[PDB]
Coordinates of C-alpha atoms in Angstrom, one line a residue:
Chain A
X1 CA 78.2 97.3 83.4
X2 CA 77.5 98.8 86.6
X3 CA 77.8 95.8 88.5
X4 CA 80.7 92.9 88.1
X5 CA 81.1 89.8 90.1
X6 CA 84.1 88.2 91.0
X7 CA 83.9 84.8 92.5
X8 CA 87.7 84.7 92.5
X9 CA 87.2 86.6 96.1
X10 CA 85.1 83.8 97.4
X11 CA 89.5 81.7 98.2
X12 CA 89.5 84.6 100.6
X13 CA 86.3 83.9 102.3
X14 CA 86.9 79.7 102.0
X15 CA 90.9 80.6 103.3
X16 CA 89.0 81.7 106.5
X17 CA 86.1 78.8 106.5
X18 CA 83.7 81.8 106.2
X19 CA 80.8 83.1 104.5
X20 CA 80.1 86.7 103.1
X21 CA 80.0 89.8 100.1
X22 CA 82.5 92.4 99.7
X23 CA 81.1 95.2 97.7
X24 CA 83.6 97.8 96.2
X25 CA 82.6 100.8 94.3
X26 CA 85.3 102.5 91.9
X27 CA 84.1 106.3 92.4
X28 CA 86.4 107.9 89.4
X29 CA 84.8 105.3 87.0
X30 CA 81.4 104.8 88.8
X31 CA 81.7 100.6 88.6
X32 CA 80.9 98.2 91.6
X33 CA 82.5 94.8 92.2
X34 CA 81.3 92.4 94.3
X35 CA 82.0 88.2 95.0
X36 CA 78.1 87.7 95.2
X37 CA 75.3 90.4 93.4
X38 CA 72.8 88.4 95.6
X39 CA 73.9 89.2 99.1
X40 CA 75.1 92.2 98.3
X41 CA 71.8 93.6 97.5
X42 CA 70.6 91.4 101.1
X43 CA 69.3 94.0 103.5
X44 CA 70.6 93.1 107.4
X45 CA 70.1 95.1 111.0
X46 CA 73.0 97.7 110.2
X47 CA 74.1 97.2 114.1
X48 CA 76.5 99.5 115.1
X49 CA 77.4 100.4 111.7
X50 CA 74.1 102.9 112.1
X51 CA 76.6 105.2 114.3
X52 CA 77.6 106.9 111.0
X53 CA 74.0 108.1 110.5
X54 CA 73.4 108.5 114.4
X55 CA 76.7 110.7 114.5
X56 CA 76.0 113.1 112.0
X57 CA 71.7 113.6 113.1
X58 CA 73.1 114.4 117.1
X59 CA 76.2 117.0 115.5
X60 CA 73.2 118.5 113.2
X61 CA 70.8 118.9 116.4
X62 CA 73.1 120.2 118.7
X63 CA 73.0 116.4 120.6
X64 CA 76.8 116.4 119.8
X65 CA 78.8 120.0 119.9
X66 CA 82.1 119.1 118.9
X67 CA 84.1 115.9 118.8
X68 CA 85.8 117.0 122.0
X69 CA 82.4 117.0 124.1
X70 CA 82.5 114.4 126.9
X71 CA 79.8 111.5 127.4
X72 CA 80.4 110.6 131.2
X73 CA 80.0 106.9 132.0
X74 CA 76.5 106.3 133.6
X75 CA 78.4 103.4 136.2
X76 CA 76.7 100.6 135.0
X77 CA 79.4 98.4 134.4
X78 CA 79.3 96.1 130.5
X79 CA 80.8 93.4 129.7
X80 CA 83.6 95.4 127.1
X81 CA 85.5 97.1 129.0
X82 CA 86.5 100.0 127.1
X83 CA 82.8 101.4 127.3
X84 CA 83.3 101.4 130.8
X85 CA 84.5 105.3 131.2
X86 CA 83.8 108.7 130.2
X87 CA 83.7 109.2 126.1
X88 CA 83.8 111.7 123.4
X89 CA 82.4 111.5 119.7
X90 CA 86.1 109.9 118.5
X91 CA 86.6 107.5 121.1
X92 CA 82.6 106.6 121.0
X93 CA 83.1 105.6 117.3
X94 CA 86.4 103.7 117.9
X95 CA 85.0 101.7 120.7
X96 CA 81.2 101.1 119.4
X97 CA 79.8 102.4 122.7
X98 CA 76.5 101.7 122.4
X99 CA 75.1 103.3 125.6
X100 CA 76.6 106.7 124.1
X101 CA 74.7 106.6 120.6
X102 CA 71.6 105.2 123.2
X103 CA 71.6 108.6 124.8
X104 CA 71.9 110.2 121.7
X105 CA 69.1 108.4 119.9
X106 CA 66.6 109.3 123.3
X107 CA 68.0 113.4 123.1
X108 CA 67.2 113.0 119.0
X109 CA 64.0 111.5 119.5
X110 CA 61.4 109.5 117.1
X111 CA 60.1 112.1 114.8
X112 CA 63.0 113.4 114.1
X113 CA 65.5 110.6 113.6
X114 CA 62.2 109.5 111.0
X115 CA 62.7 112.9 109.1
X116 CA 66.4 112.6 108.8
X117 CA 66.6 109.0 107.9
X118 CA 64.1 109.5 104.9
X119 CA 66.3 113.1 104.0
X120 CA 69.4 110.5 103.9
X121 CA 67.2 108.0 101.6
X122 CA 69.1 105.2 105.1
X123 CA 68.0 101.5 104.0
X124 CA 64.6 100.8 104.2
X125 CA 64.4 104.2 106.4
X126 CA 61.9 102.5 109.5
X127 CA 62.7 103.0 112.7
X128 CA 60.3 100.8 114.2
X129 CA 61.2 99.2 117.9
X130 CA 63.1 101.2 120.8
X131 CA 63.9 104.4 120.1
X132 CA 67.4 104.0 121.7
X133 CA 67.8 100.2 120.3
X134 CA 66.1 99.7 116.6
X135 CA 69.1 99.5 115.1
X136 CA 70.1 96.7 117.2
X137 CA 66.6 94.6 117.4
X138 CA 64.2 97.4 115.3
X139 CA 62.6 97.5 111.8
X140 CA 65.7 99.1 110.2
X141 CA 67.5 97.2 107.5
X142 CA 70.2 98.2 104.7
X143 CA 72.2 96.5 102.1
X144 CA 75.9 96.6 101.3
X145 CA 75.0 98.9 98.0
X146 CA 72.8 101.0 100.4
X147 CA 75.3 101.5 102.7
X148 CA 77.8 102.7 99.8
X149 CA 75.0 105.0 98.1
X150 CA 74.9 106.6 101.9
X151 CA 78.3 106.5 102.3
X152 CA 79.4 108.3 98.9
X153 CA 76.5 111.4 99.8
X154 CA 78.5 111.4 102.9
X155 CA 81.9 111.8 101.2
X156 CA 80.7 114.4 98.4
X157 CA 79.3 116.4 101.8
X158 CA 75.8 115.5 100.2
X159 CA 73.4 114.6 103.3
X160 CA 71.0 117.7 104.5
X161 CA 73.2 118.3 107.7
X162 CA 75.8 120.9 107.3
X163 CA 79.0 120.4 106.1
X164 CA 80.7 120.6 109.7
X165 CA 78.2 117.9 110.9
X166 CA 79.9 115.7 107.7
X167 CA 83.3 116.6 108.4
X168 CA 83.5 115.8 111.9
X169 CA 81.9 112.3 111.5
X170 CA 84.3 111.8 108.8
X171 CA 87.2 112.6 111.2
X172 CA 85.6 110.5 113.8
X173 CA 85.5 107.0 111.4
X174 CA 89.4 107.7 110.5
X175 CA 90.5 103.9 110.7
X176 CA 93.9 103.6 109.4
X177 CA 96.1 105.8 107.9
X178 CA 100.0 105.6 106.0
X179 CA 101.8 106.5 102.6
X180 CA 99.8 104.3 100.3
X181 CA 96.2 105.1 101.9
X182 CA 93.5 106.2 104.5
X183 CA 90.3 104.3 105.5
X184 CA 87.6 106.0 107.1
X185 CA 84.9 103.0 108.1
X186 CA 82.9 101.5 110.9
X187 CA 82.3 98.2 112.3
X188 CA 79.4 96.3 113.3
X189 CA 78.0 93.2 114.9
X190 CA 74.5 92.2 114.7
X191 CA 74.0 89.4 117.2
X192 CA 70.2 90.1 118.9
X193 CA 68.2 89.0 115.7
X194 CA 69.8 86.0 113.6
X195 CA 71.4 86.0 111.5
X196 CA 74.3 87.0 113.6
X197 CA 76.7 89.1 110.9
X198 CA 79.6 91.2 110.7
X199 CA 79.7 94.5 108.7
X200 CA 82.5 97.0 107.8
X201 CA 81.7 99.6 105.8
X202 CA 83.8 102.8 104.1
X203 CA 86.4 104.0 101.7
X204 CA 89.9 104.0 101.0
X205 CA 91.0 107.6 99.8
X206 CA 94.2 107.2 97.4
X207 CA 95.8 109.9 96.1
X208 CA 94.0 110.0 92.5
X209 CA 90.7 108.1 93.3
X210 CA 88.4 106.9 96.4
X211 CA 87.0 103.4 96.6
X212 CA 83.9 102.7 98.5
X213 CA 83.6 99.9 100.8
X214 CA 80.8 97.2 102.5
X215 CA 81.3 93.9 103.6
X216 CA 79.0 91.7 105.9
X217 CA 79.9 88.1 106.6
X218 CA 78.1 85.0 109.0
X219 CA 79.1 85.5 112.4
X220 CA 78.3 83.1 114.6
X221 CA 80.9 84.0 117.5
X222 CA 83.2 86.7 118.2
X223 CA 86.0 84.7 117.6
X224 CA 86.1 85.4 113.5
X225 CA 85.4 89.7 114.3
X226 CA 88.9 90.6 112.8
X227 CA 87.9 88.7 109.7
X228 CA 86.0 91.8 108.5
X229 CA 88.8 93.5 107.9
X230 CA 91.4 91.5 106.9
X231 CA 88.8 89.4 104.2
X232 CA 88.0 93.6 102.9
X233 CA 91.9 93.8 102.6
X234 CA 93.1 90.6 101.0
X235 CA 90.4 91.8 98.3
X236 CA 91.5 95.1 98.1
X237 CA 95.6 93.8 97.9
X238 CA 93.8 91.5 95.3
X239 CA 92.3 94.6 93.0
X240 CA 95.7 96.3 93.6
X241 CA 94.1 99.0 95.6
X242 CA 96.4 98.4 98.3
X243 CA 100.0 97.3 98.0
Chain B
X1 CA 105.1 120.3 137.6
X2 CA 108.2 122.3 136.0
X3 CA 107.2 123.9 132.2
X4 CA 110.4 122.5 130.6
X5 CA 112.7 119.9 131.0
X6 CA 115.5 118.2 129.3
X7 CA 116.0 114.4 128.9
X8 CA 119.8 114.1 127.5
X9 CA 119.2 110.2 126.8
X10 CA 117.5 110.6 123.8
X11 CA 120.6 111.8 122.7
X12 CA 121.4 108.0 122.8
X13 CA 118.6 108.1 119.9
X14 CA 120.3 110.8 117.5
X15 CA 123.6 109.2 118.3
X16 CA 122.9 106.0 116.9
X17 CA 122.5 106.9 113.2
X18 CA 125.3 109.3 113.8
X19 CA 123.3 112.4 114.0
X20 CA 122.5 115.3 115.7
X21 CA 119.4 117.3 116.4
X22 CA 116.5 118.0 118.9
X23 CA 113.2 116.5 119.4
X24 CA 110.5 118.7 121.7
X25 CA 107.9 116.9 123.2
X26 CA 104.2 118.8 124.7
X27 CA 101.4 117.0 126.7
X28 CA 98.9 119.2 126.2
X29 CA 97.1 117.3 129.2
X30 CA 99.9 118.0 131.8
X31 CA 101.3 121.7 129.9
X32 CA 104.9 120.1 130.4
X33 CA 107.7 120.5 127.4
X34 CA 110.5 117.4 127.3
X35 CA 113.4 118.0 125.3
X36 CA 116.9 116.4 124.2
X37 CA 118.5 120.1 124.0
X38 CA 116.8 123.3 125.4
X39 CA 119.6 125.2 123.3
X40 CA 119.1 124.1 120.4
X41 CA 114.7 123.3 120.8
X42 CA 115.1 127.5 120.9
X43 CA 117.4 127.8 117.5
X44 CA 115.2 129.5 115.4
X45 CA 115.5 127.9 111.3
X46 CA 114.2 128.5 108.0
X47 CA 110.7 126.5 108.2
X48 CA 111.1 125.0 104.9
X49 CA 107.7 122.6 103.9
X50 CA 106.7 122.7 107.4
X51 CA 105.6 126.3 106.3
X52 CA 102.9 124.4 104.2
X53 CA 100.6 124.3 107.9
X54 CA 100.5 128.3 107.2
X55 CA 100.2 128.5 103.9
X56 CA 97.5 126.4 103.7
X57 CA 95.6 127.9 106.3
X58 CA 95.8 131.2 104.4
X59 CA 95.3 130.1 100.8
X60 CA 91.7 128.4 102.3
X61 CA 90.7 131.3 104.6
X62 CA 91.3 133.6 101.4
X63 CA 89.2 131.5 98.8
X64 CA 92.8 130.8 97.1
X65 CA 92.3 127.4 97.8
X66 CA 87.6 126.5 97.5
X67 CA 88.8 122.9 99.0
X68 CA 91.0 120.1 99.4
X69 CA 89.7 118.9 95.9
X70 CA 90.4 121.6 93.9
X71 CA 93.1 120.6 91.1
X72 CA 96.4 122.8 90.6
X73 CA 97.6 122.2 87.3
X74 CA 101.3 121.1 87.2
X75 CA 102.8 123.4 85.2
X76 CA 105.1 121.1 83.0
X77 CA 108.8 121.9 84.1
X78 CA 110.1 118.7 85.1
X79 CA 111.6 119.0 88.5
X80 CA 113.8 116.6 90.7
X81 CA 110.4 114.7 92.8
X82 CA 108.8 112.6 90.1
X83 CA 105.5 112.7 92.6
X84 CA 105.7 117.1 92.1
X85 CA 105.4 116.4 87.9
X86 CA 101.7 116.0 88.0
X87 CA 98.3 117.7 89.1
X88 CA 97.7 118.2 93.2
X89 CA 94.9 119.1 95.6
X90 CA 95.8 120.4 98.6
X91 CA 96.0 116.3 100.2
X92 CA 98.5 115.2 97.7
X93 CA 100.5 118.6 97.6
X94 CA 101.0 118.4 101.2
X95 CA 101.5 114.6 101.1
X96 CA 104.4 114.8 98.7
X97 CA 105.5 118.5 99.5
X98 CA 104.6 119.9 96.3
X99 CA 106.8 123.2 96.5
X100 CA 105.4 124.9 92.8
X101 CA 101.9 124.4 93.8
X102 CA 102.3 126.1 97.3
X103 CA 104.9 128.4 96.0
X104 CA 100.9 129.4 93.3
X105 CA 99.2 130.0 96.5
X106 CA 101.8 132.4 97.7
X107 CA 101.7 134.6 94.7
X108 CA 98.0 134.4 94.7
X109 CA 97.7 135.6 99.1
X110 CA 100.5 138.4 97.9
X111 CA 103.2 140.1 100.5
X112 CA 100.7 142.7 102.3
X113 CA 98.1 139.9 103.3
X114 CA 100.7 136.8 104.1
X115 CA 102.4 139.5 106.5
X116 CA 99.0 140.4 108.6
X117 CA 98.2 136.8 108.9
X118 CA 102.0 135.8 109.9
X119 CA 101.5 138.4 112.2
X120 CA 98.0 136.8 113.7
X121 CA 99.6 133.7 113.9
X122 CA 102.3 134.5 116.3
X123 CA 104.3 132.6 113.4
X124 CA 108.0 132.3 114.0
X125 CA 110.1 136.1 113.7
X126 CA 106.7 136.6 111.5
X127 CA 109.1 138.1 108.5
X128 CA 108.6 137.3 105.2
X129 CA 111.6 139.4 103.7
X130 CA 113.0 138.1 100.4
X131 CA 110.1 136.5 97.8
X132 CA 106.6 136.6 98.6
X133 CA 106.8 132.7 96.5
X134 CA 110.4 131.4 98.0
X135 CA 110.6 133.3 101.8
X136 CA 110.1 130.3 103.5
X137 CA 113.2 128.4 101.5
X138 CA 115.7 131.6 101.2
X139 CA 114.2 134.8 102.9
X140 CA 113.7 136.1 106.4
X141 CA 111.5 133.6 108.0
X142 CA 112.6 132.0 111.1
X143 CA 110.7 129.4 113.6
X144 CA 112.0 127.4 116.7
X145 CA 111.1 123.7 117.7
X146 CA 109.3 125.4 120.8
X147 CA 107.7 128.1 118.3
X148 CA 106.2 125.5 116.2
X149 CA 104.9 123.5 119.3
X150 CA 103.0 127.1 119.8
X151 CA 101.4 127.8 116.8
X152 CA 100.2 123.8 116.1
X153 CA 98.7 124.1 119.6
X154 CA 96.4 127.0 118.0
X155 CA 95.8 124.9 115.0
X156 CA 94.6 121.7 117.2
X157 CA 92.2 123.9 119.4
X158 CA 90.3 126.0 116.4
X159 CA 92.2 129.1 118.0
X160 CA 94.1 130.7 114.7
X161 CA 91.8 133.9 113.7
X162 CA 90.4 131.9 110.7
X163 CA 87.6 129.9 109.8
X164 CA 87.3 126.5 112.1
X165 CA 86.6 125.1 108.3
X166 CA 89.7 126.2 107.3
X167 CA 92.0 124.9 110.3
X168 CA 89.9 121.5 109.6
X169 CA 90.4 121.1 106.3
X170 CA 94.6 121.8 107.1
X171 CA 94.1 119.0 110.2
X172 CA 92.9 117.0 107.8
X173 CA 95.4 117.6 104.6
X174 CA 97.8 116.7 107.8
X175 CA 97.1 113.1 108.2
X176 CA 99.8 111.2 108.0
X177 CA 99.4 108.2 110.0
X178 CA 96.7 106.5 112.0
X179 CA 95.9 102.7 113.8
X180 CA 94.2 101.4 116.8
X181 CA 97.1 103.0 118.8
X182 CA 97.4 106.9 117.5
X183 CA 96.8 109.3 115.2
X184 CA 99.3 111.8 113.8
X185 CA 98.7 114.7 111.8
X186 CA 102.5 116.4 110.8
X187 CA 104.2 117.7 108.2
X188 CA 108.2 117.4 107.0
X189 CA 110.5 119.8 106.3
X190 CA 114.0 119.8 104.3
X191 CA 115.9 123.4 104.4
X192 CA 118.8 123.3 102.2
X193 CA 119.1 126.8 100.8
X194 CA 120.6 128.5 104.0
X195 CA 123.0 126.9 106.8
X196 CA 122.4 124.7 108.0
X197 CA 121.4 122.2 106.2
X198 CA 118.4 120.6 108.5
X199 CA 115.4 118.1 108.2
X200 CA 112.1 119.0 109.9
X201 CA 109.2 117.1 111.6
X202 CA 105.9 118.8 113.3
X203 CA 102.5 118.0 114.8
X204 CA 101.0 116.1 117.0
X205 CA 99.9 112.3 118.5
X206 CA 96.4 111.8 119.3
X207 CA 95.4 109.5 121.8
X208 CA 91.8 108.5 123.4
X209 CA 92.7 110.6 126.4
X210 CA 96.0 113.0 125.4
X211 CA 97.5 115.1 122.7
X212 CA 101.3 115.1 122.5
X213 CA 102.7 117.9 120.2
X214 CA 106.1 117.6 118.8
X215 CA 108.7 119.2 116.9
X216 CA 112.3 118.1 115.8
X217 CA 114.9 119.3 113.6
X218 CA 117.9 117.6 112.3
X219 CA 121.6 118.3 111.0
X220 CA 120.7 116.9 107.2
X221 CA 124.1 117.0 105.2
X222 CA 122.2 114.9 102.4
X223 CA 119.4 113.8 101.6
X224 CA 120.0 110.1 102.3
X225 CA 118.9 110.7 106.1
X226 CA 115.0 112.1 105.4
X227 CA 113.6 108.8 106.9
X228 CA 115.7 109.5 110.7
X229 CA 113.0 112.7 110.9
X230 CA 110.7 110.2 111.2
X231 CA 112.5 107.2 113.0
X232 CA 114.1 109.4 115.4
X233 CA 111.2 110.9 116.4
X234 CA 109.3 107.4 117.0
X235 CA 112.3 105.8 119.1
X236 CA 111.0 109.4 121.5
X237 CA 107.7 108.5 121.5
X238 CA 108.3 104.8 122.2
X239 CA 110.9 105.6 124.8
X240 CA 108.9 107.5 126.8
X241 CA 105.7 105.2 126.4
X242 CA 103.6 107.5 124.1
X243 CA 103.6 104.7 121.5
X244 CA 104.0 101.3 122.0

């Protein structure tokens, strides 16, 4: 069966009074597991998530040069701090600076952030809205098991761009890293069209095998943000991916 | 702005579990070198595993190595690391030090082309006298604390003669931690074929805004130490507000 649900993962959602899927795709047997086939088949705004995508079409284009290239800080001060000073690709990513990827998106352009989203078969692959916002408040939408069919071209080096362009993204969403495991993954928050959700999507490379990751959950505040991933881990702990 | 200096209180550090050693600190930001022992950060050692950064670098730029997926075959002798008894990509050999795999590689790059690159790389004394598959255990190799700082700061800016594919895929095979906080790409050492008997730790720390390179090595009578590479080094890095 290429799909299983597990409503057992639902006592991690309910621990945290919250509302969401978890989608998990075992890449050495090619099987998914989810909590809910419904929502995670439920395309959203992919929010910041879309910096994956973004990141690897400005490298491709010559937007980006190398992960060491500086973004300066245009002055106009945000309400997060952190994207209040100069930035490169790595510290873009970390941060979700979204006046970074903004500039990016304008130097890409329409026709050609079109082509490559259709080339990467991205969500629903329309673009409609702002240029430097549709990700945000535009036409695009994406699943959780879209966002892991993406993700595993991404992994296997299988999107258009070169290989560089794919390694260097892949450096840039390095997450967490120890003895047992590494997660490469990004965050979003989509809060300028309801319904406001978190996302965090990846993988967890283990020694022997790679499981791919999505999550999205109801997000009414900020408050619940670090619920993304520590919902994604008590599941994986759960599955015995991680200790 | 003085190149090198020493900090004796982290001595305090090696002292505590009864050890002694050096740890060499580099902010690349600054070009400044900290260090418990200048003496000692220029004792030149047998590299051990840390030779693994090399080897790698070679066996990819050569076509020895296609990627960091590739399979190597264990090759059924049982040996004294239940993690080595098993099949390896370059991520998992490196991870668990998988001498036999690396030791493959070795005879595959052969004595005439490991020497040239050696050589290219500024590496250590750059002799590989004694076998082409064990030189780095038990032949002629030699590398300082302050050597190693040298040749990882090629690695980190693409700057070794190979392909910047290659010298990724090694920064990559490297990873050995990473959180909110830092990243650090390293790899361990444990020389116990020649006196003396020491334990190894190289790389780096990345932060937003700084790299800090580091190398330490350690009197290792037995084995039971490994883990102070590690702990040591991290009492360093916390001490002088690298980590928090």
């Amino acid at each position: 069966k290429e799909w299983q649900e597990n409503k057992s993962w639902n006592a991690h959602f309910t621990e945290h009074k919250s509302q969401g899927v978890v989608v998990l795709w075992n890449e050495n047997k090619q099987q998914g597991f989810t909590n809910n086939l419904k929502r995670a088949n439920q395309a959203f705004l992919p929010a910041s998530t879309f910096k994956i995508p973004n990141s690897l079409i400005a490298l491709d284009l010559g937007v980006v040069k190398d992960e060491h290239q500086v973004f300066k800080w245009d002055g106009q001060t945000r309400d997060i701090a952190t994207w209040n000073r100069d930035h490169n690709l790595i510290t873009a990513m970390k941060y979700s600076v979204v006046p970074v990827y903004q500039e990016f998106a304008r130097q890409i352009g329409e026709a050609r952030m079109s082509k490559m989203l259709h080339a990467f078969d991205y969500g629903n692959e329309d673009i409609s809205g702002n240029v430097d916002s549709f990700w945000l408040d535009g036409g695009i939408r994406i699943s959780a098991t879209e966002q892991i069919s993406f993700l595993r071209k991404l992994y296997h080096n299988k999107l258009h761009v070169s290989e560089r362009s794919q390694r260097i993204v892949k450096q840039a969403m390095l997450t967490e890293a120890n003895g047992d495991y590494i997660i490469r993954a990004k965050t979003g928050y989509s809060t300028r069209i309801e319904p406001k959700i978190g996302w965090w999507v990846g993988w967890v490379e283990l020694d022997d095998n790679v499981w791919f990751f999505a999550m999205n959950m109801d997000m009414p505040t900020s408050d619940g943000l670090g619920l993304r991933q520590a919902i994604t881990k008590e599941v994986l702990k759960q599955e015995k991916i991680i200790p």
